[PDB]
Design an enzyme around this catalytic site. Structure first.
Site, short mmCIF file in Angstrom:
data_model
loop_
_atom_site.label_atom_id
_atom_site.label_comp_id
_atom_site.label_asym_id
_atom_site.label_seq_id
_atom_site.Cartn_x
_atom_site.Cartn_y
_atom_site.Cartn_z
N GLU A 167 3.78 9.16 3.70
CA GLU A 167 4.01 7.77 4.09
C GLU A 167 5.36 7.33 3.56
OE1 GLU A 167 0.59 5.81 2.50
OE2 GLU A 167 -0.60 6.03 4.33
N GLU A 214 -5.44 1.69 -3.41
CA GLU A 214 -5.72 1.22 -2.06
C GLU A 214 -6.10 2.41 -1.19
OE1 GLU A 214 -2.66 -1.11 0.15
OE2 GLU A 214 -3.46 -0.06 1.90
N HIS A 215 -5.48 3.55 -1.46
CA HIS A 215 -5.74 4.77 -0.70
C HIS A 215 -7.12 5.34 -1.01
CE1 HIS A 215 -2.11 6.19 1.54
NE2 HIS A 215 -1.60 5.16 0.90
#
Ligand SMILES: CCCCCCO[C@@H]1O[C@H](CO)[C@@H](O)[C@H](O)[C@H]1O
Ligand SMILES: CCCCCCO[C@@H]1O[C@H](CO)[C@@H](O)[C@H](O)[C@H]1O
Lengths: 441, 43, 424, 99, 49, 146, 43
Positions: A136, A59-60
């Protein structure tokens, strides 16, 4: 018109399927804007301990450049047309979607096709995202709510893929390799596992042709030995208590095993959860709120907030509640909450169930407000139910619920059942598991 | 009413550009209070 | 599938000045809002915070419905009642299934035209001011934006959306009554509806919203002043905003500023993206390699406006980020602006506007605001044309107005390296 | 005969001899306590002093000089509007509790 | 990271019927509870006698 | 702090300095609220070590003999540290801080940069202060010469 | 020592010129703390 005639006027969602297995679904409106995206049957439930976090890593990388649009080229193109590109990963689904002007639907579909099939995954980008993800993880550690919910899954589904977090353990983040990612991708990002959904001012036929044009190359085979199927996940009555008296408020999440997406019982369960409801210190209702838990909590200042929930997965789920309160209010909160589940199992009244039904009706419709919520409903529904459930059907299902159905369904999932409990913070007063278990009957 | 707010309020994170992105204010603020939903503050 | 519709917005302005606007979408649920020119700008030095308490008092007893009935009655039909305020308007909105609009409307009318503000209920509600404010102020942006307005204006728009601490526990029933009587009047209201017929809203407004009012400095022009408020609190990150007076909403110059906002960068478009086409972001990124965030800030009001940028950075880099951002705007003011940058900005602005009226909430807010601001309705197609009409020179001139205009600044965090206006 | 007997009963009752008003003698139940809590400051403080003065007289087994006795004609209910509304609110909650 | 937190293995303590993580334990829940209930009912009657 | 701030003059004079200077003299005599509970032992040690130095100290006495005070200083105050850590020069800026609190009475101060103590110009300002009026001389007087 | 301060401090106005006279500040402030005496703030 009456609420009934209005229900029958919602355009029916159109569904088609390409040769490679990709499903294409859309709901046409007259909005000059739209949302189109790709929903995928991929998530951490599909990951093993070795590659847990792979999907989140991807996703990154998804928007960091494709073979056709290297680096920030994809980015510049999205921005210059005033579109918005977003994504999200959960334990079972992953989605990439774009909000854009309806007239830009062709380029939007091309970009999504490009993203899902030609992601660069440049070694240097992979190293950069590695550090972003680690940071994160640190930030997420400061979110007591996210921590307690990850803990609930870790204990409730211990020993199964559902126990895993979406982001994965930090050591996996430090070690995942491009090989690991390309491998994950070749295995999960196949046409039969994807749904191209769109809602807004566009026609199905246009979307379908754009899909044929841009997604046909997508593999629809894989093989036989490498077709990631899901095994049921065992639920375990258990407790995880992370005591940290340094934190100002305690967070507690408790749940019994839910039925899973496909089960008809979810409607009655949603009605019951609506009866108990949600609450927080900023609610204007206070002592007059209809939910006994809400008014008791408000008048006696028992918590800062609480929320019931029904988290669904393929064949299981978490049905329960989460609350945030002062260290001296945990036992009282648990007492009142469990008392309410028991009252519903044995004595739900027709009037409160009607209220619950009306709350659910309002939530359903007010949720499908805008092209993004609608597009997401289309994508997710196709992955979970295999079809878009129309509002008229939802109404029929809600209509079938009465006090008798609520007592029976609640009794089935709550009564004398072992819950999974997660606590974080100044929890010295969180009740012993035996006492919580006895509270279930 | 029926739909709980995105973020529930309680009374008495960021560590990277990515998670900081979007936090800068861009418009005047709006304050909302509800009967059934958490209060909110925009921008 | 092919839908029904789409119908057009029906608009009607009554003789007393009240505007009614509705859109029948044939949806299963309805959304009705009563917009009023009663935002915080209408409070004066002697009754600050009265509109904040008013915002929190929507469920207190009224002549036609008890506090208990308002809550139980609305919840019975799974309905919703909320109050939203900006510095200029207050909007009371109800949501419910379409067959129950009669019920929600009765409560809405009681709340707005017949509140009793009983002494004991008003006293019991005071503590909520403290809770509500504490929650909102957990957001540094709230601190900064409230201080920014206080620093920029001598009055009106200078007022905070939240009750000052010294006023908590001091707002009286009489002040609440006077505030409703001086501002909740026909000529200061707009009744907006979605999924409701125009005739019923028109009927409701004609029969229950025919109200003449007292006095609504509840009219006072906002006087831009300029200044700076620095709030030292030692946070690892510094939040700061720098603005200059721009233009009133509704003017052509306001459009130039909106386009300038998007040239500079007005928010992210890609999850975790590098904001490649955001002018301010790319300018700061070249010089600062520590985490930061920057965004053009644009606030447009009826008689004034504020334009500039907002920054978030580590305390030691505050000066570098702010100066780099400021210099970047200076280059635009010097004419260094390409056509492609302007068209992209126009695209973001146009797509952004259309996306904001996509949901019922955005739609209602847009119609309601137009109704109170211009007492008329400008459709999307016209708005987009007004956007295309903005010239590259108008954008450059807006930048110039910012650069040479007297500034207003607000900052919070460990300000050891945060510069003062005169150091910019 | 309910006016002649009334003034006669009022004096026989005798709370007026302690300087009390009829509402000062009401038996406090939960409705009454809430009504009293809603009284404006002056009426609350007046009530407090009349009761304190009466309790003091009672302790001394004494009564006020006749000219200070509360007069039948001047005794009015200061509590009624507040108590009536408190009862009305409760009844409303009770009707809703039955649905 | 809190995500480095995995519940320890309890396989040495689990009842045989809940040892398979790929199987739902709801099929044995009735039997597992029915036994404890039998134990409690029998004790109550014994004490009553 | 709460005790000192019961005096409006304290509020005004602290804000006046904060408004006038960019630094140093801008600091309040009272601890900022956010720092209460956060001042560490190391910061206290650091502060004493950087400022309680020989070249920054003066031992004054009244009603004591100079010899004893001299022998006390010689034997026990024979510390070092020299001039210690001087601060940055105070940079006058100008500005205004308005504190709305609804009190019946308004307290306000308006100033401009004058002169450093020790200069001849400072004397002019001290005389100007008394021309304008620098406090009462007569109990309940009308201050005829102010 | 045993000389209490002129004004004792407690924690948790003026109505005339005469009583207001002298209240205006005229010099920088000084803050004092004691072992035995109430704290004070000058000017
Ligand atoms: C608890 C009730 C379960 C079955 C509800 C089915 O409900 C029906 O579904 C159809 C297909 O979606 C709709 O076309 C129809 O209008 C609806 O009434
Ligand atoms: C928190 C501010 C006050 C909210 C208004 C409701 O106020 C409550 O109404 C009840 C009637 O149902 C009364 O019995 C109760 O005494 C009163 O406090």
């Amino acid at each position: 018109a009456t609420y009934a005639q209005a229900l029958q006027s919602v355009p029916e969602t159109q569904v088609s399927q390409l040769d490679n297995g990709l499903r294409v679904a859309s709901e046409q409106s007259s909005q000059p804007t739209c949302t189109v995206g790709v929903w995928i049957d991929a998530g951490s439930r599909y990951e093993s301990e070795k590659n847990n976090g792979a999907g989140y890593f991807v996703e990154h990388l998804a928007f960091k450049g494709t073979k056709n649009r290297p680096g920030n080229a994809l980015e510049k193109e999205v921005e210059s047309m005033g579109a918005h590109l977003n994504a999200y990963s959960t334990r079972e689904h992953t989605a990439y979607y774009i909000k854009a002007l309806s007239k830009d639907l062709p380029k939007a579909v091309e970009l999504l096709a490009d993203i899902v099939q030609n992601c660069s995954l440049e070694d240097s980008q992979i190293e950069k995202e590695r550090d972003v993800i680690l940071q994160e993880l640190q930030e997420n550690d400061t979110s007591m709510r996210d921590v307690v919910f990850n803990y609930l899954h870790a204990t409730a589904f211990q020993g199964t893929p559902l126990a895993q977090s979406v982001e994965g353990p930090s050591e996996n983040v430090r070690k995942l390799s491009r090989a690991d990612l390309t491998e994950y991708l070749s295995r999960h990002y196949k046409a039969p596992r994807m749904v191209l959904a769109a809602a807004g001012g566009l026609e199905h036929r246009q979307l379908l042709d754009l899909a044929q044009k841009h997604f046909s190359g997508l593999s629809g085979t894989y093989d036989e030995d490498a077709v990631p199927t899901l095994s049921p996940c065992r639920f375990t009555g258990s407790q995880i208590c992370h005591r940290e008296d340094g934190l100002p408020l305690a967070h507690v999440a408790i749940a019994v095993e839910g039925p899973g997406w496909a089960h008809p019982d979810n409607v009655a369960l949603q009605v019951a959860n609506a009866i108990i409801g949600h609450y927080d210190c900023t609610y204007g209702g206070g002592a007059h709120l209809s939910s006994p838990l809400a008014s008791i909590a408000a008048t006696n200042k028992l918590c800062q907030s609480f929320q019931t929930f029904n988290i669904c997965y393929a064949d299981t789920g978490l049905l329960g509640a989460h609350f945030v309160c002062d260290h001296m209010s945990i036992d009282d909160m648990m007492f009142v909450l469990q008392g309410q589940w028991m009252r519903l199992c044995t004595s739900a009244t027709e009037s409160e169930v009607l209220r619950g039904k009306n709350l659910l009706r309002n939530a359903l419709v007010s949720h499908l407000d805008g092209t993004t919520p609608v597009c997401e409903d289309i994508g997710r529904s196709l992955l979970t139910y295999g079809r878009r459930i129309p509002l008229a059907e939802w109404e029929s299902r809600i209509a079938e619920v009465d006090a008798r159905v609520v007592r029976e369904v609640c009794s089935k999932y709550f009564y004398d059942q072992c819950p999974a409990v997660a606590g974080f913070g100044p929890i010295e007063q969180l009740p012993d598991y035996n006492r919580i278990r006895s509270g279930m009957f | 009413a029926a739909v709980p707010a995105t973020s529930e309020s309680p009374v008495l994170s960021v560590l990277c550009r990515e998670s900081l992105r979007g936090q800068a204010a861009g418009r005047p603020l709006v304050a909302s209070v509800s009967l059934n939903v958490p209060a909110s503050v925009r921008y | 599938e092919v839908p029904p519709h789409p119908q057009d917005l029906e608009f009607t302005r009554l003789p007393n000045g009240l505007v009614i606007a509705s859109l029948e979408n044939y949806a299963p649920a309805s959304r009705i809002g009563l917009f009023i020119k009663a935002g915080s700008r209408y409070e004066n030095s002697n009754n600050l915070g009265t509109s904040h308490l008013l915002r929190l008092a929507s469920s207190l007893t009224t002549k036609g419905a008890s506090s208990f009935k308002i809550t139980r009655g609305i919840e019975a039909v799974g309905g919703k009642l909320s109050v939203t305020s900006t510095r200029e308007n207050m909007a009371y909105t109800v949501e419910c299934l379409r067959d129950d609009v009669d019920i929600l409307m009765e409560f809405l009318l009681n709340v707005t035209t017949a509140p009793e503000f009983r002494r004991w209920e008003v006293a019991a509600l005071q503590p909520q001011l403290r809770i509500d404010k504490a929650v909102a102020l957990q957001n540094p942006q709230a601190h900064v934006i409230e201080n920014l307005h206080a620093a920029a204006y001598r009055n009106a728009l200078a007022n905070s959306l939240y009750c000052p601490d010294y006023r908590i526990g001091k707002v009286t029933p009489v002040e609440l009554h006077d505030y409703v009587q001086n501002h909740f009047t026909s000529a200061r209201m707009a009744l907006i509806g979605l999924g409701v017929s125009h005739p019923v809203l028109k009927q409701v407004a004609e029969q229950f919203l025919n109200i003449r009012g007292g006095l609504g400095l509840s009219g006072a022009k906002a006087k831009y002043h300029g200044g700076e408020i620095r709030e030292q609190n030692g946070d690892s990150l510094v939040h700061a905003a720098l603005v200059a007076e721009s233009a009133a909403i509704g003017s052509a110059e306001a459009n130039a500023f909106s386009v300038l906002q998007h040239v500079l960068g007005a928010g992210p478009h890609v999850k975790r993206g590098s904001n490649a086409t955001s002018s301010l972001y790319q300018a700061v990124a070249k010089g600062v390699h520590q985490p930061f965030d920057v965004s053009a800030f644009n606030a447009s009001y009826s008689d004034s406006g504020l334009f500039g940028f907002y920054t978030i950075s580590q305390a030691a880099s505050a000066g570098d980020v702010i100066k780099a951002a400021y210099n970047q705007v200076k280059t635009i003011a010097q004419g260094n602006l390409s056509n492609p940058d302007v068209q992209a900005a126009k695209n973001k602005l146009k797509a952004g506007y259309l996306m904001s009226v996509e949901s019922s909430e955005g739609f209602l807010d847009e119609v309601g605001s137009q109704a109170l601001a211009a007492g008329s309705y400008t459709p999307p197609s016209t708005v987009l044309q007004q956007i295309d009409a903005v010239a590259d020179a108008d954008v450059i001139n807006a930048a110039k107005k910012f650069v040479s205009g007297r500034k207003s600044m607000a900052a919070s965090g460990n300000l050891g390296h945060t510069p003062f206006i005169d150091e910019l | 005969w309910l006016e002649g007997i009334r003034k006669w009963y009022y004096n026989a009752a005798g709370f007026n001899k302690l300087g009390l008003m009829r509402d000062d003698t009401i038996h406090e139940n939960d409705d009454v306590k809430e009504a009293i809590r809603r009284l404006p400051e002056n009426l609350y403080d007046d009530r407090v002093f009349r009761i304190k003065r009466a309790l003091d007289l009672s302790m001394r087994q004494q009564i006020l000089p006749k000219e200070q006795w509360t007069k039948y004609e001047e005794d009015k209910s200061y509590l009624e509007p507040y108590l009536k509304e408190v009862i009305r609110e409760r009844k409303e909650r009770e009707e809703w509790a039955k649905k | 990271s809190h995500t480095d937190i995995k519940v320890p293995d309890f396989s040495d303590y689990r009842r045989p019927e809940v040892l398979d993580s790929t199987k739902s334990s709801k099929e044995s829940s009735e039997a597992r509870k029915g036994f404890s209930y039998l134990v409690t009912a029998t004790t109550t009657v014994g004490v009553a006698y």
